[PDB]
Amino acid sequence: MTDRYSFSLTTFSPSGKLGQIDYALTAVKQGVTSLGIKATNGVVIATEKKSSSPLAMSETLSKVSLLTPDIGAVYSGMGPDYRVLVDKSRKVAHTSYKRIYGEYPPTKLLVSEVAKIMQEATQSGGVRPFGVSLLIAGHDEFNGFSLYQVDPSGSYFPWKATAIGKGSVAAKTFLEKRWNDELELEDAIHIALLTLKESVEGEFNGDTIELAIIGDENPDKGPRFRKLTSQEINDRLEAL
Amino acid sequence: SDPSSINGGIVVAMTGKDCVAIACDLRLGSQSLGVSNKFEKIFHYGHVFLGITGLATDVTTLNEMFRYKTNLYKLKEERAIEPETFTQLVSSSLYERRFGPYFVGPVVAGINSKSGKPFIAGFDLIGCIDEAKDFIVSGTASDQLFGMCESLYEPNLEPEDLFETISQALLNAADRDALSGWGAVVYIIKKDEVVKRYLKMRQD
Amino acid sequence: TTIAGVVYKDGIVLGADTRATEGMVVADKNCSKIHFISPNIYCCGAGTAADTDMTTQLISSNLELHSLSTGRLPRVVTANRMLKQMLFRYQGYIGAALVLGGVDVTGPHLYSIYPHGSTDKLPYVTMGSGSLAAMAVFEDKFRPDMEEEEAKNLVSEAIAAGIFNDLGSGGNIDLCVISKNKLDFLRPYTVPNKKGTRLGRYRCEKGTTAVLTEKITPL
Amino acid sequence: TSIMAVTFKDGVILGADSRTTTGAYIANRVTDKLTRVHDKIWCCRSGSAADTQAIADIVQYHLELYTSQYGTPSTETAASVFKELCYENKDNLTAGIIVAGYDDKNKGEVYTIPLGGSVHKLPYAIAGSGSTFIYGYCDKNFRENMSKEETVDFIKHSLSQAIKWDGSSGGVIRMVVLTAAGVERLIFYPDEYEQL
Amino acid sequence: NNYDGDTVTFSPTGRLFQVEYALEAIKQGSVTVGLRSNTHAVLVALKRNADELSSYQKKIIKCDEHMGLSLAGLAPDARVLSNYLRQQCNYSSLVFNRKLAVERAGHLLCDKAQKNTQSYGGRPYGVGLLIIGYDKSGAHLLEFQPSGNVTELYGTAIGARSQGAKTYLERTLDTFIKIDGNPDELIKAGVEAISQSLRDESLTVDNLSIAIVGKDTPFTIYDGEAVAKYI
Amino acid sequence: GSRRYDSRTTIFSPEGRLYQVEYALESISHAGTAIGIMASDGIVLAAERKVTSTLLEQDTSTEKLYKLNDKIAVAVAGLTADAEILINTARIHAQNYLKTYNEDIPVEILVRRLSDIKQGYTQHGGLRPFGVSFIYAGYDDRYGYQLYTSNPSGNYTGWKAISVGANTSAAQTLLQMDYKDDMKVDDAIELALKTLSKTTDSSALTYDRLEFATIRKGANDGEVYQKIFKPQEIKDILVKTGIT
Amino acid sequence: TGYDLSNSVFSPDGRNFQVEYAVKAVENGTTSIGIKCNDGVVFAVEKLITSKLLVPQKNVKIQVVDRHIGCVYSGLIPDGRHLVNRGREEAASFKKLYKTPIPIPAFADRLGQYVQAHTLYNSVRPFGVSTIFGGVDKNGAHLYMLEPSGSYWGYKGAATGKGRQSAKAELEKLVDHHPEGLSAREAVKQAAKIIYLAHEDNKEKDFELEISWCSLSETNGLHKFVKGDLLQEAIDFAQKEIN
Amino acid sequence: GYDRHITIFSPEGRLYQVEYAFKATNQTNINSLAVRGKDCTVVISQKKVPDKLLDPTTVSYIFCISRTIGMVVNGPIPDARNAALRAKAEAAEFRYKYGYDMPCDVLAKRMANLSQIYTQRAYMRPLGVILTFVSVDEELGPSIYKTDPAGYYVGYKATATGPKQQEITTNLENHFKKSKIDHINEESWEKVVEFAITHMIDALGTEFSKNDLEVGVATKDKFFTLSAENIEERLVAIAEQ
């Protein structure tokens, strides 16, 4: 055992394309739809719990993850790749930030750190890029509420609202029509549930949808991240 | 031999009503020999002020180190560091040399730009935080300053009342210390103006 | 310092004084010595204060990451292990002397952790320079399976013993009551000494200090 | 500290006082110095509490991992792991450990590991500061193939004396019985043993 | 074919082509013969010159007072392996005050050669060795192949046209094994054996190299006019 | 072994070109155009964002213009993630220099450092180069206002005006036509926007598709000020110059 | 295609062709066997006499590990030696820590994990040997056989090499005709016969029989080579059965 | 086409080596099943001893990882043992560092995160195995967690693995559709094993003797495998009703 792969597995092709990044993006395209919408007093992130079997307990599989008390993440693409990015995002939020400054990182900086990790898989020796795109929603004192997308390349962009994966083209058009700068958090949740219904084939309820918010503090502060319960989603599906 | 009392000198910081004050003497010596009467011990990174007593090479090094760190902090965060955050940064930075420490006695002073709350803090040489509202003292005449501050101080002083309190605390403490004095500086810090005053004191 | 803990019927009561000393001088009269480890676990700290702070913070941080990955509340034994194995590794050079108390899935647990990496699992413990004063109160009056307000009084009484009789200890009494149903962080629980009242005003009048030069810069 | 392990007909019994002192201060008067490294392999600890705790935890780990792979370890194997740690780290340790365990093949076995890190297999073993005072007594009163009640009494009397004379020892006498029948914990309070 | 790019790749019939190509380098090397009795062990080696101005490449290397080898193939690899034997012989003497057993020497050479055949980046050794020695169990002769296969024999030969010498020894087996307490007659049998592998060229004074080890004979090499006696 | 899969990123072609550098430059040619223009009294950085949707949060967005210290900024063309790796390295070099000499790093020294890092990826390590070209806009008290560019090869050069990314050929001709040495910042602002307006592959140049910045000594008491333009300010300067 | 050019590559089947190619080297080797008896194990191997110049009884193939384990293998002989060297390191580190000599199942997995490790990367070649090994431990006798993939199982009898089918058929008869078990001295005789019968697949060249054994009664649970009279008695029994 | 030899993306966004490792999974031709009772978790697996020379006691794909955790493997034995040894090592290290027994799901996630690494790093191949972990967790109760070569993992009410997994899965799905509960409502593990075996017989359409099965049972504070005679008693009870 020598890890002999000390050379890049992502290289520029004659056209200027980085093949593996493009192919990672194709993997993201095949993944289940997830979306994010930013309101004035909160952010919402949502995705479909595409259950691989009905015998599987889909509650045990969390697609929406808490990164810090005020930051949450969702993805489209390869689940195992997402899981290890969440682990590293949680850890880096302590090592390179909380243990130094005594507070959690702001959304943009935690995003930047995740982006860095993904960029390094795009240039380091003997690795493929991550096969996920992340949607990171968060709050911090000086920047307020924010929503970011992070792609396999390591590129990130802040969004008012967006979607990624399967039905993203259609979903983004849907969001463009509905979004305005005066949405309350409940209005954004309502729009998220509408937008997500289009890309979902089968059952559409609190058990098959995962949806979280970055909003008010839930009681040194309380955490702004909150994952909506199966019941809380179903309540809003009656007013749909 | 004792690194914390080769070069000498003192820093004191106080809170007031919508203001903080931090002050230091100007002496640098080699024990008995006075060398410099222009060795200031208070620095600032944005609106956060940091006094440092102790071994002068470490005072200089830590200033340069916190300038470095707060500059990168600002570039990344797109805002100036706050006193509360900086205090934690100082503590971290000191404790990472736990078993080969900087022989210093740092003192943070500033006003939180968002909340407006006056803030001071002190540390031992390995970064334990003294987080006191009233006053923070440091240096070779720290005992002297503790006494002066405890009897002179009272809460919610107006900027120019506070000036007289911190100045007299510094001056009279310094004059009972062989290794402090040779001049003094007092910063009066408010939410959006800072007044720096050099004091007239005995030059022995 | 005087720090103590007891195991009572429903859980744990931790106690601490508030005097932070540099040598013989008192730097802070209201210093917090009861530290957060996790939501169900707290740590009273004595010995070298920086070591106590940073050791509890590091293990609190690592337990937070552990608890995010497992999705369940951390245990006192894992806090105990992580503190213990670190302190042992450093052979006493990290002068952290902790009273660790918390409530698990397995019930309430109380530990004393020493700088060298030994730990005792006990129904009551005391540490710091006021441990003997505090322990006298526990040997006098402790019984197993106390009610909450009784245990609170006993710990408070034990900290008080340290405050008065030990010079290293002083200020206020902080408690932390941990049970399955709640966490009560009582700071301060008691103020056994009034701050001394000063009879004169020694503050100088404006223009008393002699200034050489002045500079004003706006922000 | 006063500790002992004694083999008898049906297996082995470990015994210990409960006092842990910091100089003349009794830091813990109800210490459990009988620690479990496997189902029916236990040890008596003397020396640095930090060191003997750290060792006993590492041993428990090694025997847990041994058991995962190769099934129940022998008492000899447990003693060998203790020894390996104590001997290889003799310069940084102060540990005097008695290892006692029950196999069905071998029955009761007692191994003592003194400061050097040497191993000695014995019918019974005594150790700790309070052991000096009972070499005479234990040598005169020990017999092989005692009954459970005789061995409980032998340990009770012996540690009673060790406690009486040694200021570093005291509190309750804990015992752990290791037989085919299982694991039994016994405790004996001052009011019982002092009047012997 | 596709499976000969490196040593780490088995062919579809379970062959290691790089090892077989290394084996080929030996066949291209000059002939050398080994043989022994109960008292002595002999190496005979036909040295090869580049041209008439050049020297004749040395084939025999001494490993200890009681052991040494003859080489056929890449001479630098023989130097590496002989140096390794010298060290192992030396380590045995220094640490255990013990002359290294010839059988154990073979085992060590085998395992050294093996590591080069299972790992990426390296290459097999491109040389064959005939190790003679006299140890506590009498005279010994070994044949080393860079595959790793070491083999204890009464007599053998390796290199170009070595089959002729090897057949001769196979016939002479019952005669030369009995040449006890007579070094010169054992060398004669070795010189006669190596002669069966000659074509066109014959054994001249600076062509022939002979070595011997035995009961009361340290490993000594004979070159030049020392071997004229046997021509 | 592994050799089979090795692209060999650090080799010459038979013509004496570095394949990966050339292909990285091809990558960069598709990136949004960035322009730097140096005047006598300041520098202008202008850059075109790419793809954009109406839903992109522009005011908190930074893909083109980055701050290295208070005196030096960069405009990016290429992989934004690759740039941010290099940017954080540069930001450290400036502070290491400041800590060592107690003076702000000279612009060229920083530029050489980054450019030397890029070079290293082309000569050793077997890794792909950084798919990034920088325009460096900076000031120091030796040379005053300076523009540089670097590219994946690690080569850097100094400029009076320059473009990188898309349509550089067209952009450089238009700059070469209208640039003059006595020009001022307000004029260079106008030239930069006019050049982008003609070379853009979009239908029209609007505020939401631009990042814009100026480094002026034009401050009170002769001190250098970096101004990263806000979305509303870019919209105002577009109206002022008469493009919208 | 190209899936067989690199070790540790899954073909579209889910196979590692390089390992299967290693098996071909094993199948190419000489016949080796193992027989589990009442209180021990017997190992035997076919040693092809390539030439008259080979010294008889000198080129020993069966290797001892620790003092209680015997190993024999078919295929690339150096690869087998490399594996036994590792086995000796494993058995040594086990005894150093745990005092007791390594149990056979424990030892089997040590070899198993190591051989399997050489199917995890393209920088190493798989082992070109099937290894038959075993001995006596505290739980009695154990016989194992370990393939290039890292696969191993416990066996009543085992056989590998060119004459494995012949041998296997013979081993299966013994298992059927002796459910109560085979004695150690019987197993030595039977081992000799089975190598002699399995020699029909390598019939061109003549061969040399080598046998070893661990038995609780016959060798005190230690690995010993069958030598002299007992070896000749087993050869005579084998020669009688072929005629 | 080297995108099929190592773990890099194909143009479709696929990792062919991961997919081919999944195919290696069925190379044993063994079907496993896992179900949960009230107090227990039962895992059963087919046992096939094709060679008469094999010692049938040593032919096992069920592993005792810790005292509380059992692991059945669907895939070749060398990779199964690779995974077993690591899972044991991880479970022991966990208990040492954190002072309590490694939970079933935490181990599963740990093994899954390791499996993920082999799908991203080129020098390491995936293991050709699916790992089904079982325990009676002290917090979560009866637990079934499964890991595969992709590095995916999830908790199960019940599961099945192997060539005929779909038949077993649907058989189980249909039973839980009737009962409308996440478990086998049964007090004794003995009857939960009887259920597991019965529903495998129905799904596969094959009868079993005592030597055709291999059974693992997790209870509170221990996991254990049943002997041939314990299984025979189980089979007798099934036949008698």
Ligand SMILES: *[C@@H](CS(C)(=O)=O)[C@H](Cc1ccc(CN)cc1)NC(=O)CNC(=O)[C@H](CC(C)C)NC(=O)[C@H](Cc1ccccc1)N=[N+]=[N-]
């Ligand atoms: C009481 C401990 S005691 C005297 O053994 O009973 C308190 C405990 C305590 C816990 C938590 C906090 C707040 N995080 C504070 C105190 N410990 C002390 O009073 C010990 N005091 C300190 O550590 C001083 C804190 C300063 C902020 C006043 N620091 C010192 O005395 C340093 C100690 C030191 C010196 C050299 C090397 C290492 C440490 N002396 N100085 N400069």
Ligand SMILES: [Cl-]
């Ligand atoms: Cl992990």
Ligand SMILES: [Mg+2]
């Ligand atoms: Mg003075």
Ligand SMILES: [Mg+2]
């Ligand atoms: Mg003076």
Ligand SMILES: [Mg+2]
């Ligand atoms: Mg006593």
Ligand SMILES: [Mg+2]
């Ligand atoms: Mg891979």
